[PDB]
Each structure stands twice: as structure tokens, then as C-alpha cells.
Design a protein around this ligand. Structure first.
Ligand SMILES: [Cl-]
Ligand SMILES: [Cl-]
Length: 162
């Protein structure tokens, strides 16, 4: 297991624009296209993303290319973030994957705001950090995925995901 297989299990793959859990226009492997309500704003952002007129539909290769760029930006973002970088630096390889996952889903800014959980992760207080993470809109809105990520932080293994 690795970051790509973990996020592919969490986000799925869809080759047609769809709406995410929040109701946003998305495509492929959790690639958010726009928060606007217009389907055309979404098709325009899609075509700009892919470099071709897509009519709202892309191929598996194209999905995978967006996914690759998105994991990359997620990682880079963490490393540039003054609040995230130190936490990342302090963790082991599995838990690093978990942070990435949380950053992919909710963006650097949000994650950065989880002040208390971040400090707890940094100190290596696993159980406490898992409890704290659960007291969030995040966990209440997408509880199964959140429990998987949380277990990943708690354990340091990939158990939540075999
Ligand atoms: Cl893009
Ligand atoms: Cl869920």
C-alpha cells in the first residue's frame, strides 16, 4: 500500500463530471473542478485542466495524470506550509501518507487549522490525536473515510485499508 492506492480507494475513479459529497463538480480521482454551481463553469475548468475540448468526459490516462499532479501539489503544499512541514517531518512513512490524504481532501488551509491534532501528532500522542480528529465537521460529514484515515494515524499501519 502507498499514497496513491490509499487515495484511489478513498476517492474512487469516475470518468464523467460528477458531484462530490459537498455537491461540487469533480472528475476522475477526487479532482475538484469548481465550487460554482454551473455545469458549464465545470466543463470550462475541465477543458482548461486537460488542454482539449472534452465535453465533460476524460480517459483513464487523463484522470491518472490529474491525480499524479494533485498528489504532487498536496505533498509540495505540506512542505511549504510552516505549520504542516514540521508535523510531516516528524512522522513515519505511513502517517505521512495519512497527512497527505487529509491535505488532498481538505486542502492545506483547512488542515493547517487543525491546530490541536497537529500538536498531538507531533508529540506522538496517537490515541489522543485520534480522539481530537474525530471532533470535526470532517469526521461527521464523511465518517467512514475519516475513520480510515484516523486509524492510520492511530496505528501507523495500513490495516484500515487490506
Ligand atoms: Cl489542474
Ligand atoms: Cl465516508
Amino acid at each position: 500500500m502507498n499514497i496513491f492506492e490509499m487515495l484511489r480507494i478513498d476517492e474512487g475513479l469516475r470518468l464523467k463530471i460528477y458531484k462530490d459529497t459537498e455537491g461540487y463538480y469533480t472528475i476522475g480521482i477526487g479532482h475538484l473542478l469548481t465550487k460554482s454551481p454551473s455545469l458549464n463553469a465545470a466543463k470550462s475548468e475541465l477543458d482548461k485542466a486537460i488542454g482539449r475540448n472534452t465535453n465533460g468526459v476524460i480517459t483513464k490516462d487523463e484522470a491518472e495524470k490529474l491525480f499524479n499532479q494533485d498528489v504532487d501539489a498536496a505533498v509540495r503544499g505540506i512542505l511549504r506550509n510552516a505549520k504542516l512541514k514540521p508535523v510531516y517531518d516528524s512522522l513515519d512513512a505511513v502517517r505521512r501518507a495519512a497527512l497527505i490524504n487529509l491535505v488532498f481532501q481538505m486542502g492545506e488551509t483547512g488542515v493547517a487549522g487543525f491546530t490541536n491534532s497537529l500538536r498531538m501528532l507531533q508529540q506522538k500522542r496517537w490515541d489522543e490525536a485520534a480522539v481530537n480528529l474525530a471532533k470535526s465537521r470532517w469526521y461527521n460529514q464523511t465518517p467512514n473515510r475519516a475513520k480510515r484515515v484516523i486509524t492510520t494515524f492511530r496505528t501507523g499501519t495500513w490495516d484500515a485499508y487490506k
